[PDB]
Design a protein around this ligand. Structure first.
Ligand code: NAG
Ligand code: NAG
Ligand code: NAG
Ligand code: CA
Length: 463
């Protein structure tokens, strides 16, 4: 009962390895004409194929950079390790996959870049617009002396940065930052206003931090008067907050989903009164820096994935990518499996796994292992496979054009040997009628300088 490695009918060592991650290849050169070269290292060894002649690579994962996770006695030297390990060298066989783990622990509180994109349309009364202003100031007042950094972009018809991160980091004065704020009293171009924040506000030269969390807090009282797409703000955590008379219907409050992040059950917050703005943020603030979601970057196309997350109390949740509801010092762990489809050419690839809002990341160097090591003495068209006709790599003949078979002989063949008794009419009879050899199961006739024997079984010397 030969299994998959044998039964694939392989022609080279590189294809035997590509059968399955379990298969192995023999290359003993001086072996019988019939003994499957592709098998397992045990079944292959029950036939004597020598030690060093068997080609069998194995996938492996090795941990390179494995800094230990930081502690509560935090002293910023080489910063603080929040993800470990950081560098792992993977080596994969054709259609192979092995597993490895990662551990995340927010030893720092968490750096956040938050932007108040608040409506200023003609629908707001001066009191509620002030309440929206008092909402922003109150948010920034109890979040000073944290790792937060704030901006604010009033919008209506036009879009105006009231202050950006370089201002806040300098002053840390909520009232004096938003004291210049004047009510626009116009329309609601939410699409263009959201693009403004993604392209003009989150700029590093305006106090932005390239490793912090991108958080948008959209506060609106009605539906958008413009139209477009917010694809520029696809990597920003967006909270939209429709408020008031113009979201009393379930229809009108569903429009904000296209702006809000997903799931919209979490990132859409409909209010009937501007007074509820006070309590609304004290609960969003509990869902901002409390979830670690892994982020796969620059992933090669031929790499598959898998995840087994261990979140709260050893809750092994397969598939999951994020563990939420964490505090300072809590540690999580994720087990990951990476499969490959075949064998890409690219000798070395490198992709990053990093939690969102963090700078510590896991970088994976994947070097594929497909080619065999018996290419030393590949030998194009060797003396063993007849000259000019067959490469003798890894103990077998990879014949060129027209020629096939063992020592390269087949002309235009029959597309398998199968029953080798095609060369004679009956059991107790010589093969080829004693005028030729049984090449590839069919009887080819011996041409001589005198007569030519044109016929199956080599019978009629035509002269
Ligand atoms: C700021 O917070 C730190 C703790 O992180 C504390 O030691 C310090 O006294 C605080 N200062 C002010 C002005 O809030
Ligand atoms: C996760 O667990 C499932 C079930 O035990 C298993 O099939 C899968 O290979 C595991 N994956 C990883 C990456 O641990
Ligand atoms: C090898 O095959 C080619 C045709 O494919 C033929 O011309 C050549 O003669 C063959 N080699 C020998 C040694 O006969
Ligand atoms: Ca409005």
């Amino acid at each position: 009962g030969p299994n998959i490695c044998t039964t694939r009918g392989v022609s080279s060592c590189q294809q035997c390895l590509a059968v399955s991650p379990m298969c192995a290849w023999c290359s003993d050169e001086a072996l019988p004409l019939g003994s499957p070269r592709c098998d397992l290292k045990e079944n292959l060894l029950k036939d004597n194929c020598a030690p060093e002649s068997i080609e069998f690579p194995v996938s492996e994962a090795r941990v390179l950079e494995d800094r230990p996770l930081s502690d509560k006695g935090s002293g910023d030297s080489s910063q603080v390790t929040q993800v470990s390990p950081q560098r792992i060298a993977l080596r994969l066989r054709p259609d192979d996959s092995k597993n490895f783990s990662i551990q995340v622990r927010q030893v720092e509180d968490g750096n956040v870049d938050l932007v108040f994109l608040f409506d200023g349309s003609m629908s707001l009364q001066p009191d509620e617009f002030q309440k929206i202003l008092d909402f922003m100031k109150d948010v920034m007042k109890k979040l000073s002396n944290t790792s937060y950094q704030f901006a604010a972009v009033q919008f209506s018809t036009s879009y105006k940065t009231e202050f950006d991160f370089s201002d806040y980091v300098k002053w840390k004065d909520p009232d004096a930052l938003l004291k210049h704020v004047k009510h626009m009293l116009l329309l609601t171009n939410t699409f263009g206003a959201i693009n403004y924040v993604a392209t003009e506000v989150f700029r590093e030269e305006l106090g932005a931090r390239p490793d912090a969390t991108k958080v948008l807090i959209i506060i609106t009282d009605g539906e958008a008067t413009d139209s477009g797409n917010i694809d520029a703000a696809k990597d920003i955590i967006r909270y939209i907050i429709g408020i008031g008379k113009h979201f009393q219907t379930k229809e009108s409050q569903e429009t904000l989903h296209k702006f809000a992040s997903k799931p919209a059950s979490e990132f859409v917050k409909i209010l009937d009164t501007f007074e509820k703005l006070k309590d609304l943020f004290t609960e969003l603030q509990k869902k901002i820096r409390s979830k670690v979601e892994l982020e796969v970057r620059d992933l090669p196309e031929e790499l598959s994935l898998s995840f087994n997350a261990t979140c709260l109390n050893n809750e092994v949740i397969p598939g999951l990518k994020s563990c939420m509801g964490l505090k300072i010092g809590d540690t999580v762990s994720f087990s990951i499996e990476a499969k490959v489809r075949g064998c890409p050419q690219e000798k070395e690839k490198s992709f990053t796994i990093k939690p969102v809002g963090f700078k510590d990341s896991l970088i994976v160097q994947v070097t594929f292992d497909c080619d065999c090591a018996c290419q030393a003495q590949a030998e194009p068209n060797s003396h063993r496979c007849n000259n000019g006709n067959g490469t003798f790599e890894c103990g077998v003949c990879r014949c060129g054009p027209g020629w096939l078979g063992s020592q390269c002989e087949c002309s235009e063949e029959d597309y398998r040997p199968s029953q080798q008794d095609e060369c004679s009419p009956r059991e107790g009879q010589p093969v080829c009628s004693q005028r030729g050899e049984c090449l590839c199961g069919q009887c080819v006739c011996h041409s001589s300088d005198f007569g030519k024997i044109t016929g199956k079984y080599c019978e009629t010397r035509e002269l």
